[PDB]
Design an enzyme around this catalytic site. Structure first.
Site, PDB file in Angstrom:
ATOM      1  N   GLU A 165       0.695  -1.530   0.303  1.00  0.00           N
ATOM      2  CA  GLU A 165       0.268   0.149   0.306  1.00  0.00           C
ATOM      3  C   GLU A 165       0.874   1.304  -0.046  1.00  0.00           C
ATOM      4  O   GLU A 165       2.254   1.225   0.720  1.00  0.00           O
ATOM      5  CB  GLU A 165      -1.257   0.086   1.159  1.00  0.00           C
ATOM      6  CG  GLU A 165      -2.543   0.883   0.836  1.00  0.00           C
ATOM      7  CD  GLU A 165      -2.856   0.522   1.420  1.00  0.00           C
ATOM      8  OE1 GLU A 165      -2.783   1.100   3.311  1.00  0.00           O
ATOM      9  OE2 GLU A 165      -3.974   0.325   1.812  1.00  0.00           O
ATOM     10  N   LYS A 195       0.125   5.001   1.141  1.00  0.00           N
ATOM     11  CA  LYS A 195      -0.057   5.747   2.137  1.00  0.00           C
ATOM     12  C   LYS A 195       0.753   6.773   2.716  1.00  0.00           C
ATOM     13  O   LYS A 195       1.507   5.622   3.526  1.00  0.00           O
ATOM     14  CB  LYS A 195      -1.020   4.817   2.772  1.00  0.00           C
ATOM     15  CG  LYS A 195      -1.312   4.907   4.146  1.00  0.00           C
ATOM     16  CD  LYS A 195      -2.521   4.190   5.163  1.00  0.00           C
ATOM     17  CE  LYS A 195      -1.129   3.193   5.997  1.00  0.00           C
ATOM     18  NZ  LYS A 195      -2.320   2.339   6.456  1.00  0.00           N
ATOM     19  N   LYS A 230      -8.134   2.517  -2.559  1.00  0.00           N
ATOM     20  CA  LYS A 230      -8.211   2.409  -1.438  1.00  0.00           C
ATOM     21  C   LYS A 230      -9.148   4.088  -0.098  1.00  0.00           C
ATOM     22  O   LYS A 230      -7.855   5.327  -0.450  1.00  0.00           O
ATOM     23  CB  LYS A 230      -7.207   2.482  -0.739  1.00  0.00           C
ATOM     24  CG  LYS A 230      -6.940   1.041   0.540  1.00  0.00           C
ATOM     25  CD  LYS A 230      -7.853   0.501   1.541  1.00  0.00           C
ATOM     26  CE  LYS A 230      -6.875  -0.693   2.140  1.00  0.00           C
ATOM     27  NZ  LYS A 230      -6.549  -0.401   2.962  1.00  0.00           N
ATOM     28  N   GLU A 260     -15.151  -5.340   2.865  1.00  0.00           N
ATOM     29  CA  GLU A 260     -13.980  -5.743   3.478  1.00  0.00           C
ATOM     30  C   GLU A 260     -14.643  -5.655   5.066  1.00  0.00           C
ATOM     31  O   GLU A 260     -15.757  -5.444   5.209  1.00  0.00           O
ATOM     32  CB  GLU A 260     -13.575  -4.134   3.749  1.00  0.00           C
ATOM     33  CG  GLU A 260     -12.918  -3.647   5.074  1.00  0.00           C
ATOM     34  CD  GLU A 260     -11.672  -2.544   5.868  1.00  0.00           C
ATOM     35  OE1 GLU A 260     -10.903  -1.877   4.735  1.00  0.00           O
ATOM     36  OE2 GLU A 260     -11.944  -1.620   6.497  1.00  0.00           O
ATOM     37  N   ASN A 284      -9.907  -6.455   7.875  1.00  0.00           N
ATOM     38  CA  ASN A 284      -9.366  -5.732   9.116  1.00  0.00           C
ATOM     39  C   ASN A 284      -8.969  -5.874  10.121  1.00  0.00           C
ATOM     40  O   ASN A 284     -10.689  -5.646  11.185  1.00  0.00           O
ATOM     41  CB  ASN A 284      -9.868  -4.897   8.517  1.00  0.00           C
ATOM     42  CG  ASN A 284      -9.286  -3.237   8.455  1.00  0.00           C
ATOM     43  OD1 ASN A 284      -8.164  -3.374   9.417  1.00  0.00           O
ATOM     44  ND2 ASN A 284      -9.119  -1.977   8.428  1.00  0.00           N
ATOM     45  N   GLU A 316      -5.685  -7.521   5.833  1.00  0.00           N
ATOM     46  CA  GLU A 316      -5.675  -6.462   5.546  1.00  0.00           C
ATOM     47  C   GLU A 316      -5.432  -6.237   7.283  1.00  0.00           C
ATOM     48  O   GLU A 316      -5.456  -6.673   8.027  1.00  0.00           O
ATOM     49  CB  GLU A 316      -7.017  -5.950   5.342  1.00  0.00           C
ATOM     50  CG  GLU A 316      -7.804  -5.672   4.066  1.00  0.00           C
ATOM     51  CD  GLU A 316      -9.485  -5.404   4.291  1.00  0.00           C
ATOM     52  OE1 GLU A 316      -8.939  -3.320   3.675  1.00  0.00           O
ATOM     53  OE2 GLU A 316      -9.695  -5.450   4.337  1.00  0.00           O
ATOM     54  N   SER A 317      -4.052  -5.208   7.637  1.00  0.00           N
ATOM     55  CA  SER A 317      -3.540  -5.007   9.179  1.00  0.00           C
ATOM     56  C   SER A 317      -2.897  -6.022  10.149  1.00  0.00           C
ATOM     57  O   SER A 317      -2.952  -7.139   8.957  1.00  0.00           O
ATOM     58  CB  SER A 317      -4.830  -4.324   9.683  1.00  0.00           C
ATOM     59  OG  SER A 317      -5.158  -3.275   8.492  1.00  0.00           O
TER      60      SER A 317
HETATM   61  O1  LIG Z   1      -4.736   3.196  10.506  1.00  0.00           O
HETATM   62  C1  LIG Z   1      -6.250   3.996  10.475  1.00  0.00           C
HETATM   63  O2  LIG Z   1      -6.064   5.227  11.206  1.00  0.00           O
HETATM   64  C2  LIG Z   1      -7.445   3.625   9.944  1.00  0.00           C
HETATM   65  C3  LIG Z   1      -8.583   4.449   9.905  1.00  0.00           C
HETATM   66  C4  LIG Z   1      -9.743   4.427   9.123  1.00  0.00           C
HETATM   67  C5  LIG Z   1      -9.885   2.907   8.301  1.00  0.00           C
HETATM   68  C6  LIG Z   1      -8.097   2.350   8.183  1.00  0.00           C
HETATM   69  C7  LIG Z   1      -8.039   1.272   7.030  1.00  0.00           C
HETATM   70  O3  LIG Z   1      -9.217   1.648   6.194  1.00  0.00           O
HETATM   71  C8  LIG Z   1      -9.060   2.510   5.185  1.00  0.00           C
HETATM   72  C9  LIG Z   1     -10.085   2.579   4.219  1.00  0.00           C
HETATM   73  C10 LIG Z   1      -9.789   3.180   2.830  1.00  0.00           C
HETATM   74  C11 LIG Z   1      -8.158   4.280   2.173  1.00  0.00           C
HETATM   75  C12 LIG Z   1      -7.845   4.441   3.855  1.00  0.00           C
HETATM   76  C13 LIG Z   1      -7.631   3.378   5.118  1.00  0.00           C
HETATM   77  C14 LIG Z   1      -6.895   2.810   9.131  1.00  0.00           C
END
Ligand SMILES: O=C(O)c1cccc(COc2ccccc2)c1
Length: 258
Positions: free
Chosen positions: A53, A55, A115, A164, A185, A215-216
């Protein structure tokens, strides 16, 4: 309810974009874009897929990386064996944008997952217009009838929905919606807590024909392998890659894990 604050921001930002790029134009641009890649085929390749990803930040982490050159990051990810690249496009909490998606699409051959927090049809066509092959749909964000239609509209554009879920009940909802790919997630989007036991609570429950993505929570090969041992077909990894000084080597370690 971090979800909901994220969502009110998203609805405003989509409306503001749509005021400058009408739904007809984005529909036309989506229709005109080169067809999406077959994400299901990619997901079905041998080995645990690594969805790497792009990000820059998150509510939970704060600032992660400046990513001045997301194309170059995605290039590293492909070079390292990534199956898919995930590009976060939410601007207010994650500091992403569609520009990142354009940059990644132009630079890699592997499929691209947009995403973001899909609340409206506009964003689906917008994803397609900007080259996404796979689109995130979040069950906790979406009332079932809206889920079903967003899923239907995604697939009618050739895209694969990565639906998700965080709970078995969300999973059941996803399945009833027609999900082919279900992502679990570990993070609870309402409260931002990362429960690692999620995937293994939920994944066993799913039909075998459905693709399972964790995820995660992936810090290295051991977490990848654990999800792998609980039925994961692929894992999504962001924080540990974006903050890496050698994202291609970091990806390559995960791709070859086991
Ligand atoms: O790390 C965080 O604080 C977090 C908060 C809300 C969603 C997500 C992960 O899911 C997404 C979904 C769409 C875009 C980015 C993250 C991560």
């Amino acid at each position: 309810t971090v979800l909901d604050s994220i969502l009110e921001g998203v609805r405003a930002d989509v409306a503001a974009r749509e005021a400058s790029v009408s739904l007809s134009e984005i529909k036309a641009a989506a229709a005109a874009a080169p067809p999406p890649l077959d994400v299901m085929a990619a997901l079905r390749e041998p080995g645990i897929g690594v969805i790497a990803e792009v990000k820059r930040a998150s509510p939970s982490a704060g600032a992660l990386a400046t990513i001045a050159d997301p194309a170059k990051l995605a290039q590293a990810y492909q070079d390292g064996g990534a199956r898919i690249v995930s590009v976060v496009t939410e601007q207010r909490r994650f500091q992403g944008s569609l520009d990142d998606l354009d940059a990644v699409r132009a630079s890699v051959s592997i499929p691209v997952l947009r995403k973001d927090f899909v609340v409206q049809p506009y964003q689906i066509h917008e994803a397609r217009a900007h080259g996404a092959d796979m689109l995130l749909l979040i069950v906790a964000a979406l009332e079932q009838s809206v889920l079903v239609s967003m899923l239907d509209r995604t697939e009618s554009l050739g895209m694969t929905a990565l639906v998700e879920v965080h709970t078995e009940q969300e999973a059941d909802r996803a399945l009833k919606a027609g999900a082919k790919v279900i992502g679990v997630n570990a993070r609870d989007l309402m409260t931002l807590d990362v429960d690692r036991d999620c995937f293994a609570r939920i994944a066993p429950g799913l039909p075998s024909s459905v693709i399972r993505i964790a995820e995660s929570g992936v810090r290295g090969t051991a977490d990848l392998l654990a999800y792998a041992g609980a039925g994961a077909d692929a894992v999504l990894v962001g924080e540990g890659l974006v903050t890496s000084g050698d994202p291609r080597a970091a990806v390559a370690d995960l791709v070859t894990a086991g």
